[PDB]
Design a protein around this ligand. Structure first.
Ligand SMILES: C[C@@H]1CC[C@@]2(OC1)O[C@H]1C[C@H]3[C@@H]4CC=C5C[C@@H](OCCC(CO)CO)CC[C@]5(C)[C@H]4CC[C@]3(C)[C@H]1[C@@H]2C
Ligand SMILES: C[C@@H]1CC[C@@]2(OC1)O[C@H]1C[C@H]3[C@@H]4CC=C5C[C@@H](OCCC(CO)CO)CC[C@]5(C)[C@H]4CC[C@]3(C)[C@H]1[C@@H]2C
Ligand SMILES: C[C@@H]1CC[C@@]2(OC1)O[C@H]1C[C@H]3[C@@H]4CC=C5C[C@@H](OCCC(CO)CO)CC[C@]5(C)[C@H]4CC[C@]3(C)[C@H]1[C@@H]2C
Ligand SMILES: C[C@@H]1CC[C@@]2(OC1)O[C@H]1C[C@H]3[C@@H]4CC=C5C[C@@H](OCCC(CO)CO)CC[C@]5(C)[C@H]4CC[C@]3(C)[C@H]1[C@@H]2C
Ligand SMILES: C[C@@H]1CC[C@@]2(OC1)O[C@H]1C[C@H]3[C@@H]4CC=C5C[C@@H](OCCC(CO)CO)CC[C@]5(C)[C@H]4CC[C@]3(C)[C@H]1[C@@H]2C
Ligand SMILES: C[C@@H]1CC[C@@]2(OC1)O[C@H]1C[C@H]3[C@@H]4CC=C5C[C@@H](OCCC(CO)CO)CC[C@]5(C)[C@H]4CC[C@]3(C)[C@H]1[C@@H]2C
Ligand SMILES: C[C@@H]1CC[C@@]2(OC1)O[C@H]1C[C@H]3[C@@H]4CC=C5C[C@@H](OCCC(CO)CO)CC[C@]5(C)[C@H]4CC[C@]3(C)[C@H]1[C@@H]2C
Ligand SMILES: C[C@@H]1CC[C@@]2(OC1)O[C@H]1C[C@H]3[C@@H]4CC=C5C[C@@H](OCCC(CO)CO)CC[C@]5(C)[C@H]4CC[C@]3(C)[C@H]1[C@@H]2C
Ligand SMILES: C[C@@H]1CC[C@@]2(OC1)O[C@H]1C[C@H]3[C@@H]4CC=C5C[C@@H](OCCC(CO)CO)CC[C@]5(C)[C@H]4CC[C@]3(C)[C@H]1[C@@H]2C
Ligand SMILES: C[C@@H]1CC[C@@]2(OC1)O[C@H]1C[C@H]3[C@@H]4CC=C5C[C@@H](OCCC(CO)CO)CC[C@]5(C)[C@H]4CC[C@]3(C)[C@H]1[C@@H]2C
Ligand SMILES: C[C@@H]1CC[C@@]2(OC1)O[C@H]1C[C@H]3[C@@H]4CC=C5C[C@@H](OCCC(CO)CO)CC[C@]5(C)[C@H]4CC[C@]3(C)[C@H]1[C@@H]2C
Ligand SMILES: C[C@@H]1CC[C@@]2(OC1)O[C@H]1C[C@H]3[C@@H]4CC=C5C[C@@H](OCCC(CO)CO)CC[C@]5(C)[C@H]4CC[C@]3(C)[C@H]1[C@@H]2C
Ligand SMILES: C[C@@H]1CC[C@@]2(OC1)O[C@H]1C[C@H]3[C@@H]4CC=C5C[C@@H](OCCC(CO)CO)CC[C@]5(C)[C@H]4CC[C@]3(C)[C@H]1[C@@H]2C
Ligand SMILES: C[C@@H]1CC[C@@]2(OC1)O[C@H]1C[C@H]3[C@@H]4CC=C5C[C@@H](OCCC(CO)CO)CC[C@]5(C)[C@H]4CC[C@]3(C)[C@H]1[C@@H]2C
Ligand SMILES: CCCCCCCCCCCCCCCC(=O)O
Length: 1206
C-alpha cells in the first residue's frame, strides 16, 4: 500500500523538533493494539537498497584504490569516506550542546552573585538578574527540548550504517564460493547479521564524545580555575583517579562473572537432565540425588553471584558518592589554602564538577568501549567480505540453437588441498529429452555428477558448452519465508492455465485438504506448517513451472511416491522435458529400469553406461502482590524497615552535605557584614567546627551509600536464592501430568532466563532505580524547602507526567513488541538463502532474493524508526517537564528575593540543574524494572504449582514389605483427568505369589497405563492392596523404591559410572564389582579410559544403546527387589543385545515376580502365563492350550495374524 508516507516528510521544523507529527500514531496506540499495518514506511533515502548500493560503491572504490596502491583494503576507510560529511555536520550541535552545558553554571553564578549583594532598592540589578535568568532558561531549553532531534539524527546515522552493512553482508553471502562456504558456517554469518552488526547502532551515539569529552573537560577546568584557583585541580584529580580504578574494578567484575557462568551452565545442564528425564527420575525414586547435586551447584553459583553483586553495589555506591568526594576534596583544599567560601563560587564549582564528572565517568568510557566494539565488528565484517567468491558466471557463448555437448578431461575436486583427486574420469554427452539415470549410495559422487553442470565443481581453465537453463532440485527441499504464491511464482509471471493444469493433473489437492487456506496459505516460520513432501513437490513444481532446459533433480522422488514420480515423469520429464536436458539422479531401483539410459560412477570411475541389457541387477501489569511476594522472600519486614531507613539516611546526608556548604557561605557572609559594617576586628570563622562537620557529613554520605547498596543487593539476591530453592523443590514434587502438559523448553527457559534475570539484572536495575528516584525526590524536596510555593505548580506538573507516562507506555510496549517480531524474518531469510544457495545461483535469481531481503530489512527498519522516534517523543516531553521545573525554580527565586539568601538560592538552582538527567534516568529505569518483574511473576507462579502425594509419610510400612511378592488389582479405574478419556475400566487382576507374567495391549492403548497405575506416579483412581496394604499408606518414595522397572528407552545421567549405577551409595563396592562381573560388564567399564570414575559424556552419547540396556539391567540387578517390570516396547533395539538381556533377566531374576509389557509376542510366549488385556477389559484368563484353541481369544487372533508358530 501507499502506507502513510512518513509524516517526517511533511513535518516542518517545529513539528520535527517537538515530534508533533507522531501524535496521531499514539492516538490509535491508545485506542487499540498496534499492528504492522499501522506502521510508517521508511523514508526514500533510508531504503535498504539505496544505502546498500551507496556503500557498495564506496567499498568497491576503496578496494580498487587499495589494489592500486598495493595495501590491504580497510572497511573503516570506506565507512568514513561515506558518512564523514553527514557526521561532521551533526557534530556542530554537539559542540553547541557542550558549550551550553559549560556556560550554564556561569549564569547560575551570576544569579547567585546578585543574591549575595542584595539591595531591595536597586532596580537595575534586579533587571540584570532577570536577564541572567532568561539566558539560563534559554540554555536549559537548548539542553532539554533541542537535543532530542540531534539525538534522533545520530541514531539514524547509526541505523543507516547498520542497514547498509546488512545489505553488504547478504549481497556477499549470496555470491560466496563453495570452498569459502565450507570454511565458514551459516551460523557465523547469521551471527554477523544478528549481534556483530548491532554495535553500529550504539557507537554512533557516543562517537562525537571522543572529542567532546577531552575538550569540554579542559574548558570546565579552566572555568573552575577562574572561580577557585589551584584548589580546582584537587577535585579534578579525584575525577581522573576515578577513571582507571573503576575500570580496573570492572576487569575484576568480568572475571567473577566468568566463574559464575561455568557454575550456571553446569546447573542448567542438570536442569535439562532432570526435566528431560523426569519420568525416569520419579520412576526410580532418584529425586534426592539430583536435589542435593543441584543444591550444591546452586550454592556455589550463589556464592559467586553474591561476591559479584557486592562488587557491583560498591561500584554503584562509588558512582553515587563520587560527586560528594570531589566537592569535599576541592573545597577542603580551598578553605585550607586561606580562602573564604561564598555561595556563588561554591555552587558554580558544584555544578561544573557535576557536569564534568557525569561526562568523564559516563560518556567518555562508554564512547571508548563502544568504539572498540564497533572496530572489532568492522574487522570481522571486513574479513568476511573479502572471502573468496564463486567464479563469476561468464557470458554464455552464442549457442545458436545447437546441441554440441561434450565433457573431456573433467577436473572436479571437492577439496583442492586434497592430493587425492575427488573425481578423474567423467565424460558423457546429454541429448535433448533423453534421461540419464545416475545412481550412487548415500550420495556416493552424486554431488560431482550434479555440479558437473557448472554448479560448483567448475574447471579452473576452459569452458564446457552447456546450453539452456538449469533447474536444480537439491537433496534438502527448501521453502523460503513467504507464501506458496512466492515459491510457485519465483519471479515467473502468473501463468493461470499451466499452473491450473499442473495443480489438477499433478493432483496437489493434498495441500488444499491439509492446509486450512490453500495455495494462498502463509508459510509459517521455517515452513513447519508444510512437510518435506510439500517442499519436494513444490521444488519439482517450481522446476517444471519455470520450464527450464537442464533439469537437475537430486533424488526428488525419494520424498514422493512411485505414482507421483511416474506422473511427473510422463507429464514433465516425458512431455514437458521432451527436448529438454533431464540429468536425473535416481535410486530405489524402479526408475532405473523405468528410464532408458543409466550412468553409474564410483570415485571418478564410470561403473557402466549401458541400459538394462547389461544384466547389472543393481506485557501486562504486575500487581502489588508480585512485588510483595518478591520482597518478603528476601528478608523479614524489619529488615525492609531498616533498609528504607538506611536509604532515607543516605539521601538526607547527601543533600545535607551541600546544605552545609550553603549554610557555611551564609554564615561567612553575615560574618563579613559584621566585620566590615560593624566591628573593625576581622573575626575569623572557626575552621575546626565547620570543616569537621563538613567532613563528617561527606563521610556519612559515603558510608550510608555503601551500606544501602550492599544491603539492597544482599536482600534481593537472597530473595532470588529463596525463590529458586522453593521453585526447584516444588517442581521436583510436581506430578508427571505437569511435565507432560508443559514442554521441556518452557520449564528450562523458566529455570534459565528468569533465574538469570533475578540473579544478575533485576537487583542491579532495582538498586539503580531506587537510587535515582531518591535523588529526584531529594532535588524536588530541596526546591520545595527553599521556596514552599513551588508546591503549588508541582501538583499539576507531576499529575501530567503520570498521565503522559501511561499515554506513552500503551504505545511504546507495542512498538517494542513489533520491533521484536520484525527482526527474525531477516535472519530466517538469510538462513534460507544460505541453505539453498545452490539453486538460487542455478536460477540466476540473485536479484530477486536481494529484493526480498531488502523488503524484509525495510520492515524492520520501519520498526526501528518507530522505536527511535517514540522514545524521542517521550524524552522531549519529559525534558520539557524538567525544564519547566527549572524555569519555575530560577524565576521564583527572583520573584521571592526579599525572603531568600544566597545559599538557599544556590542550593535549589544547582539541584534543579541536575533534575533533568536524573529524572530521565529514573523514568527509564522504572520502566525497565516494571518490564523485568514478569520473570519474578513467572518464578512465583512456579513456586506454588500443585504437587502430588508426599514421598514419605510419618507412618512407614515394614522394611521387609516385599516378602511375599503378591500384588493384585481390585477394581481400579485409572483417570488421567477427571471427566476425561477412559483408560482403565474396573481393572481387576490376580497375580500369584512369585509368578512371572506379562500382558499385551494395542499399540500402547492400556500398555503404559498399567505401569502408571502400579507405580502410582500418575495417581490411579483405584483401591489396591498389594500384600494386603493400601497403596496409599506407603509413601511415594517408599513405594517406588521397592519397584524395579526397565524403561523402553534407557537413559544415562552425567556423572561417574558409580553414581549412575548407584547414586545413593547404598551398595558396597565389591557388590557392584561382583554383580557387574557376573554380567561381564566390569571388563567393559574397566577398558574405559577413565576407569571407575570415567567422565561420562552428554547422557552417554558415545555409549551404544546395547550398553544402555546393559547398564539399566545392572541397575535392576543392584536394586535387588522382589518384583521387576520389563517395559520392552522399543522398536529400534539391537537384537543381539535383546537376546542377551532376555537370557540375563531369565537367569538373574529367575524367581522374581516380573510384569512384562511388550509388543514382541515371542517375548511373552516364554512367560508361563499371559493375561491379555485391552481397553480396560480383561479379555483372556485361561490355560495357554485354551488360548490356542479358542478362535475368539485375542491371543490366538494375533497368533493367526502374524503367522508365527511355536
Ligand atoms: C547564549 C549567549 C550567552 C552569552 C550572552 O548572549 C547569549 O548572554 C547575554 C546576556 C547579556 C547581558 C544581559 C543584561 C545585561 C544588563 C545590562 O544593563 C542594563 C540593564 C537593562 C536590561 O539589560 C535594563 O536597564 C548591561 C548588559 C548585560 C550585562 C548583558 C551583557 C551581554 C550578555 C552577557 C549577553 C551575552 C553575549
Ligand atoms: C593541566 C591542566 C590543563 C591546562 C590547565 O588546567 C590544568 O592549566 C591551568 C593553567 C591555568 C592558567 C594559570 C595562570 C593564569 C594567569 C592568571 O593571571 C595572571 C597572573 C599573574 C600574571 O600577571 C598576576 O596577574 C589568569 C589565569 C591563567 C591564565 C590560568 C588560566 C587557566 C589555566 C590555563 C589552566 C588550564 C585549564
Ligand atoms: C593533583 C594535585 C591535587 C592537589 C594539589 O595539586 C594537584 O593541590 C595543590 C595546591 C598546592 C599548594 C598551593 C600553593 C602553595 C605555594 C607555596 O606556598 C605558598 C602558600 C600558599 C597559601 O598561602 C600560596 O598560594 C608552597 C606550595 C603550596 C602550599 C602548594 C603545595 C602543593 C599543593 C598542595 C597542590 C596539591 C598537590
Ligand atoms: C585525592 C587527592 C589526594 C589528597 C590531596 O589531593 C587530592 O588532597 C589535597 C589537600 C592538600 C592540603 C590542603 C591544604 C594544605 C594546608 C597548607 O599547609 C601550609 C599552610 C600555609 C602554607 O600554604 C598557609 O596556606 C598547604 C598544604 C596543605 C597541607 C595541602 C597538602 C596537599 C593536600 C593534602 C592535597 C593532596 C595531594
Ligand atoms: C582530544 C583528542 C580526541 C581524540 C582522541 O584523543 C584525544 O581520543 C583518544 C581515544 C582513542 C581510542 C581509545 C580506545 C580505542 C579502542 C581500541 O580497541 C582496542 C582496545 C584494546 C587494546 O588493548 C583494549 O584496550 C582501538 C583504539 C581506540 C579506538 C582509540 C583510538 C584513538 C583515540 C580515538 C584517541 C584520539 C587521538
Ligand atoms: C532524626 C532525623 C535526623 C535528620 C533530620 O530529621 C530528623 O534532622 C533534622 C534536623 C534539621 C535541621 C535543624 C536545624 C536547621 C537549621 C536551620 O537554619 C537556621 C538558620 C539561622 C541562622 O541563619 C536562622 O534561624 C535550617 C534548617 C536545619 C538545617 C534543619 C534541616 C532539616 C534537618 C536536618 C532534619 C533532618 C531531616
Ligand atoms: C559519624 C561518623 C563518625 C565520626 C565522624 O565521621 C563520621 O563524624 C564527624 C563528627 C566530627 C566532629 C564534630 C564536631 C566537632 C567539634 C569541634 O571541636 C570543638 C569546637 C567547638 C565545639 O563547641 C568549640 O567550642 C570540631 C571537631 C569535632 C570534634 C569534629 C571532628 C571530626 C568528627 C569526629 C567527624 C568524624 C570523621
Ligand atoms: C542527623 C543529621 C546529622 C546532624 C545534623 O544533620 C542531621 O544536624 C544538623 C543540625 C545542625 C545545627 C543547627 C543549629 C546550630 C546552631 C548554631 O549556633 C549555635 C548557637 C545556639 C546553640 O548553641 C544558641 O547558643 C551552631 C551550629 C548548629 C549547632 C548546627 C550544626 C550542624 C548541625 C548539627 C547539622 C548536622 C549536619
Ligand atoms: C524525607 C527527606 C527528609 C529530609 C529532606 O529530604 C527529604 O527534607 C528536606 C528538609 C530540607 C530543609 C528544610 C528547611 C530548610 C531551612 C531553610 O532556611 C530558611 C529557614 C527560614 C525561612 O524563612 C525559617 O523558616 C533552608 C533550606 C533547609 C535547610 C532545607 C534544606 C533541604 C532539606 C534538608 C531536605 C532534606 C533532603
Ligand atoms: C517524598 C517527600 C515529598 C516532599 C518532601 O520530602 C520528600 O519535601 C520536603 C520539604 C519539607 C518542607 C521544607 C520546609 C518547610 C518550611 C518550615 O517552616 C516552618 C515555618 C515556621 C516553623 O517554626 C517558622 O519558620 C516547616 C517545614 C517545611 C514545610 C518542610 C516540611 C516537610 C517537607 C514538606 C518535606 C516533604 C515530606
Ligand atoms: C519528612 C520529614 C518531615 C519533618 C521534618 O523532617 C523530614 O521536616 C524537616 C523540616 C525542618 C524545619 C525546616 C525549617 C525550620 C525553620 C528554622 O528557623 C525557624 C525560625 C523561627 C523559629 O522560632 C524564628 O522565630 C528552624 C528549624 C526548622 C523549624 C526545621 C526543624 C526541623 C524540621 C521540622 C524537619 C522535620 C524533622
Ligand atoms: C495540595 C497541595 C498541598 C501542599 C501545598 O500545595 C497544595 O499547599 C500549599 C499551601 C501553602 C502555604 C499557605 C500559606 C502560607 C503562609 C505564608 O506566610 C505565613 C505568614 C503569615 C501571613 O501570611 C501567616 O498567615 C508562608 C507560606 C505558607 C506556609 C504556604 C507554603 C506553601 C504551601 C504549603 C503550599 C503547598 C505546596
Ligand atoms: C509542560 C510542557 C508543555 C506541555 C506539554 O509538554 C510539556 O505537556 C505534554 C503532555 C502532553 C499530553 C499528555 C497526555 C494527554 C492525554 C491524552 O488523552 C487522550 C484523549 C484523546 C487522545 O487519544 C482522545 O482519545 C490526549 C493527549 C494529551 C493531552 C497530551 C498532549 C500533548 C501534551 C500536552 C504535551 C505538551 C507538549
Ligand atoms: C513562573 C514561576 C513559577 C511560579 C511563581 O514564580 C514564577 O509565580 C510567582 C507568583 C507568586 C505569588 C504572587 C502573589 C502572592 C500574593 C501574596 O499575598 C498573599 C495574599 C493571598 C493572595 O492575594 C495569598 O494568601 C502572597 C504571595 C503570593 C501568593 C506569591 C507566592 C509565590 C508565587 C506563587 C511565585 C511562584 C514561585
Ligand atoms: C518522582 C516520581 C517519578 C519517578 C518514578 C516514575 C515511575 C513510577 C510512577 C508511578 C507508578 C506507575 C503509575 C501507576 C501505574 C500505571 O498506570 O502503570
Amino acid at each position: 500500500q501507499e502506507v502513510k508516507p512518513n509524516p517526517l516528510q511533511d513535518a516542518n521544523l517545529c513539528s520535527r523538533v517537538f515530534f508533533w507529527w507522531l501524535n496521531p500514531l499514539f492516538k490509535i496506540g491508545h485506542k487499540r493494539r498496534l499492528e504492522e499495518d499501522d506502521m510508517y514506511s521508511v523514508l526514500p533515502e533510508d531504503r535498504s537498497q539505496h544505502l546498500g548500493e551507496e556503500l557498495q560503491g564506496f567499498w568497491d572504490k576503496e578496494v580498487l584504490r587499495a589494489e592500486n596502491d598495493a595495501q590491504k583494503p580497510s572497511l573503516t576507510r570506506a565507512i568514513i569516506k561515506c558518512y564523514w560529511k553527514s557526521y561532521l555536520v551533526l557534530g556542530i550541535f554537539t559542540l553547541i550542546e557542550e558549550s551550553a552545558k559549560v556556560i550554564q553554571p556561569i549564569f547560575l553564578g551570576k544569579i547567585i552573585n546578585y543574591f549575595e549583594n542584595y539591595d531591595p532598592m536597586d532596580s537595575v540589578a534586579l533587571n540584570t538578574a532577570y536577564a541572567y535568568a532568561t539566558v539560563l532558561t534559554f540554555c536549559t531549553l537548548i539542553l532539554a527540548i533541542l537535543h532530542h532531534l540531534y539525538f534522533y539524527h545520530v541514531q539514524c546515522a547509526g541505523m543507516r550504517l547498520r542497514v547498509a552493512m546488512c545489505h553488504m553482508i547478504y549481497r556477499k553471502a549470496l555470491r560466496l564460493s563453495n570452498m569459502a562456504m565450507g570454511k565458514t558456517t551459516t551460523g557465523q554469518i547469521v551471527n554477523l547479521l544478528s549481534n556483530d552488526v548491532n554495535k553500529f547502532d550504539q557507537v554512533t551515539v557516543f562517537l562525537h564524545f571522543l572529542w567532546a569529552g577531552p575538550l569540554q573537560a579542559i574548558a570546565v577546568t579552566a572555568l573552575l580555575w577562574m572561580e577557585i584557583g589551584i584548589s580546582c585541580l584537587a577535585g579534578m584529580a579525584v575525577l581522573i583517579i576515578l577513571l582507571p580504578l573503576q575500570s580496573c574494578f570492572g576487569k575484576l567484575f568480568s572475571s567473577l562473572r566468568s566463574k559464575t557462568a561455568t557454575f550456571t551452565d553446569a546447573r542448567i545442564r542438570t536442569m535439562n537432565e532432570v526435566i528431560t528425564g523426569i519420568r525416569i527420575i520419579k520412576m526410580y525414586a532418584w529425586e534426592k540425588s539430583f536435589s542435593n547435586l543441584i543444591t550444591n551447584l546452586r550454592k556455589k553459583e550463589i556464592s559467586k553471584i553474591l561476591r559479584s553483586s557486592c562488587l557491583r553495589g560498591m561500584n554503584l555506591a562509588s558512582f553515587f558518592s563520587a560527586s560528594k568526594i570531589i566537592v569535599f576534596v576541592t573545597f577542603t583544599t580551598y578553605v585550607l589554602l586561606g580562602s573564604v567560601i561564598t555561595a556563588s563560587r561554591v555552587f558554580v564549582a558544584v555544578t561544573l564538577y557535576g557536569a564534568v564528572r557525569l561526562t568523564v565517568t559516563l560518556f567518555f568510557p562508554s564512547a571508548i568501549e563502544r568504539v572498540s566494539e564497533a572496530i572489532v565488528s568492522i574487522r570481522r565484517i571486513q574479513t568476511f567480505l573479502l572471502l573468496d567468491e564463486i567464479s563469476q558466471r561468464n557470458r554464455q557463448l552464442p549457442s545458436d540453437g545447437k546441441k554440441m555437448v561434450h565433457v573431456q578431461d573433467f577436473t572436479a575436486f571437492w577439496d583442492k588441498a586434497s592430493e587425492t583427486p575427488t573425481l578423474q574420469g567423467l565424460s558423457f554427452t546429454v541429448r535433448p529429452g533423453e534421461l540419464l539415470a545416475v545412481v550412487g549410495p548415500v550420495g556416493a559422487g552424486k554431488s560431482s555428477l550434479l555440479s558437473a553442470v557448472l554448479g560448483e565443481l567448475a574447471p579452473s581453465h576452459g569452458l564446457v558448452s552447456v546450453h539452456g537453463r538449469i533447474a536444480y532440485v537439491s537433496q534438502q527441499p527448501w521453502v523460503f519465508s513467504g507464501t506458496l504464491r512466492s515459491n510457485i511464482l519465483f519471479g515467473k509471471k502468473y501463468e493461470k492455465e499451466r499452473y491450473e493444469k499442473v495443480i489438477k493433473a499433478c493432483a496437489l489437492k493434498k495441500d488444499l485438504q491439509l492446509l486450512e487456506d490453500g495455495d494462498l496459505t502463509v508459510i509459517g516460520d521455517r515452513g513447519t506448517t508444510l512437510s518435506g513432501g510439500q517442499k519436494a513437490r513444490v521444488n519439482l513444481a517450481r522446476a517444471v513451472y519455470q520450464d527450464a532446459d537442464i533439469y537437475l533433480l537430486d533424488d526428488p522422488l525419494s520424498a514422493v511416491d512411485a505414482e507421483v514420480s511416474r506422473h511427473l515423469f510422463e507429464l514433465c520429464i516425458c512431455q514437458i522435458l521432451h527436448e529438454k536436458i533431464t540429468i536425473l539422479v535416481t535410486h530405489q531401483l524402479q526408475y532405473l529400469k523405468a528410464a532408458s539410459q543409466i550412468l553409474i560412477l564410483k570415485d571418478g570411475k564410470m561403473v557402466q553406461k549401458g541400459t538394462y541389457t547389461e544384466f547389472l541387477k543393481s506485557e501486562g501489569k504486575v500487581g502489588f502482590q508480585a512485588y510483595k511476594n518478591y520482597f518478603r522472600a528476601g528478608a523479614h519486614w524489619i529488615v525492609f524497615i531498616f533498609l528504607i531507613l538506611l536509604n532515607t539516611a543516605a539521601q538526607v546526608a547527601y543533600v545535607l552535605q551541600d546544605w552545609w556548604l550553603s549554610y557555611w557561605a551564609n554564615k561567612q557572609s553575615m560574618l563579613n557584614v559584621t566585620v566590615n559594617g560593624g566591628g573593625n576586628v576581622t573575626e575569623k570563622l572557626d575552621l575546626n567546627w565547620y570543616l569537621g562537620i563538613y567532613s563528617g557529613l561527606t563521610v556519612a554520605t559515603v558510608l550510608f551509600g555503601i551500606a544501602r547498596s550492599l544491603l539492597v543487593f544482599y536482600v534481593l539476591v537472597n530473595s532470588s536464592q529463596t525463590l529458586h530453592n522453593k521453585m526447584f523443590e516444588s517442581i521436583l514434587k510436581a506430578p508427571v501430568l505437569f511435565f507432560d502438559r508443559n514442554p521441556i523448553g518452557r520449564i528450562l527457559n523458566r529455570f534459565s532466563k528468569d533465574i538469570g534475570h533475578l540473579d544478575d539484572l533485576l537487583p542491579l536495575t532495582f538498586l539503580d532505580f531506587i537510587q535515582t528516584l531518591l535523588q529526584v525526590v531529594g532535588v524536588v524536596s530541596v526546591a520545595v524547602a527553599v521556596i514552599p510555593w513551588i508546591a503549588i505548580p508541582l501538583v499539576p506538573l507531576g499529575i501530567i507526567f503520570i498521565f503522559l507516562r501511561r499515554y506513552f507506555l500503551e504505545t511504546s510496549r507495542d512498538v517494542k513488541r513489533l520491533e521484536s517480531t520484525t527482526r527474525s524474518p531477516v535472519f530466517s531469510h538469510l538462513s534460507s538463502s544460505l541453505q539453498g544457495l545452490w539453486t538460487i545461483r542455478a536460477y540466476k535469481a540473485e536479484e530477486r532474493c536481494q529484493e526480498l531481503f531488502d523488503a524484509h530489512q525495510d520492515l524492520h527498519s520501519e520498526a526501528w524508526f518507530l522505536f527511535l522516534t517514540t522514545s524521542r517523543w517521550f524524552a522531549v516531553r519529559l525534558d520539557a517537564i524538567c525544564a519547566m521545573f527549572v524555569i519555575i525554580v530560577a524565576f521564583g527565586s527572583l520573584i521571592l528575593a526579599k525572603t531568600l539568601d544566597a545559599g538557599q538560592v544556590g542550593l535549589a538552582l544547582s539541584y534543579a540543574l541536575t533534575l533533568m538527567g536524573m529524572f530521565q534516568w529514573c523514568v527509564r529505569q522504572s520502566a525497565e524494572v516494571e518490564n523485568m518483574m514478569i520473570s519474578v511473576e513467572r518464578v512465583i507462579e512456579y513456586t506454588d504449582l500443585e504437587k502430588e502425594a508426599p514421598w514419605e509419610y510419618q507412618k512407614r510400612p515394614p522394611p521387609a514389605w516385599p516378602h511375599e511378592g503378591v500384588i493384585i488389582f481390585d477394581n481400579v479405574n485409572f483417570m488421567y483427568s477427571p471427566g476425561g478419556p477412559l483408560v482403565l475400566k474396573h481393572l481387576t487382576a490376580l497375580i500369584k505369589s512369585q509368578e512371572k507374567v506379562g500382558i499385551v495391549g494395542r499399540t500402547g492403548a492400556g500398555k503404559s497405563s498399567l505401569i502408571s497405575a502400579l507405580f502410582r506416579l500418575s495417581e490411579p483412581e483405584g483401591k489396591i492392596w498389594i500384600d494386603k496394604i493400601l497403596t496409599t499408606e506407603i509413601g511415594l518414595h517408599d513405594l517406588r523404591k521397592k519397584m524395579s522397572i526397565i524403561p523402553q528407552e534407557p537413559v544415562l545421567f552425567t556423572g561417574t559410572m558409580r553414581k549412575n549405577l548407584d547414586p545413593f551409595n547404598e551398595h558396597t563396592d565389591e557388590e557392584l564389582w561382583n554383580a557387574l562381573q557376573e554380567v561381564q560388564l566390569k571388563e567393559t567399564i574397566e577398558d574405559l579410559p577413565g576407569k571407575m570414575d570415567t567422565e561420562l559424556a552428554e547422557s552417554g552419547s558415545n555409549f551404544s544403546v546395547g550398553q544402555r540396556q546393559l547398564v539399566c539391567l545392572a541397575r535392576a540387578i543392584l536394586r535387588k527387589n522382589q518384583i521387576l517390570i520389563i517395559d520392552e516396547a522399543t522398536a529400534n533395539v539391537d537384537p543381539r543385545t535383546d537376546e542377551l538381556i532376555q537370557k540375563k533377566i531369565r537367569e538373574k531374576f529367575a524367581h522374581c515376580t516380573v510384569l512384562t509389557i511388550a509388543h514382541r509376542l515371542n517375548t511373552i510366549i516364554d512367560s508361563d502365563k499371559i493375561m491379555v488385556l485391552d481397553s480396560g477389559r480383561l479379555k483372556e484368563y485361561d490355560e495357554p492350550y485354551v488360548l490356542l484353541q479358542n478362535k475368539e481369544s485375542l491371543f490366538y487372533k494375533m497368533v493367526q495374524q502374524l503367522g508365527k508358530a511355536e
